[PDB]
């Protein structure tokens, strides 16, 4: 992909946000 690295980064950012979010409330 011409932007495979970037999307992987926009998601690395979003996923990182998901986890930093999930950190407090896991089972929810």
From Swiss-Prot:
Give the transmembrane ranges: 3-19
Q: Which ranges of this chain reside in the Extracellular compartment per its record?
A: 20-28
Subcellular location(s) per record: Synaptic cell membrane; Cell membrane
Q: Which family does it belong to?
A: Belongs to the ligand-gated ion channel (TC 1.A.9) family. Acetylcholine receptor (TC 1.A.9.1) subfamily. Beta-2/CHRNB2 sub-subfamily.
Q: Which disease is it linked to?
A: Epilepsy, nocturnal frontal lobe, 3: An autosomal dominant focal epilepsy characterized by nocturnal seizures with hyperkinetic automatisms and poorly organized stereotyped movements.
What is the role of this chain?
Component of neuronal acetylcholine receptors (nAChRs) that function as pentameric, ligand-gated cation channels with high calcium permeability among other activities. nAChRs are excitatory neurotrasnmitter receptors formed by a collection of nAChR subunits known to mediate synaptic transmission in the nervous system and the neuromuscular junction. Each nAchR subunit confers differential attributes to channel properties, including activation, deactivation and desensitization kinetics, pH sensitivity, cation permeability, and binding to allosteric modulators.
SUBUNIT field: Neuronal AChR is a heteropentamer composed of two different types of subunits: alpha and beta. CHRNB2/Beta-2 subunit can be combined to CHRNA2/alpha-2, CHRNA3/alpha-3 or CHRNA4/alpha-4, CHRNA5/alpha-5, CHRNA6/alpha-6 and CHRNB3/beta-3 to give rise to functional receptors. CHRNA2:CHRNB2 and CHRNA4:CHRNB2 nAChR complexes exist in two subtypes: LS (low agonist sensitivity) with a (CHRNA2/4)3:(CHRNB2)2 and HS (high agonist sensitivity) with a (CHRNA2/4)2:(CHRNB2)3 stoichiometry; the subtypes differ in their subunit binding interfaces which are involved in ligand binding.
Name of this chain's protein: Neuronal acetylcholine receptor subunit beta-2
- List the gene name: CHRNB2
Q: Which start and end residues of the full protein are shown?
A: 264 to 291 of 502
């Amino acid at each position: 992909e011409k932007m495979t690295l970037c999307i992987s980064v926009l998601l690395a950012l979003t996923v990182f946000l998901l986890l930093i979010s999930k950190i407090v409330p896991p089972t929810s």
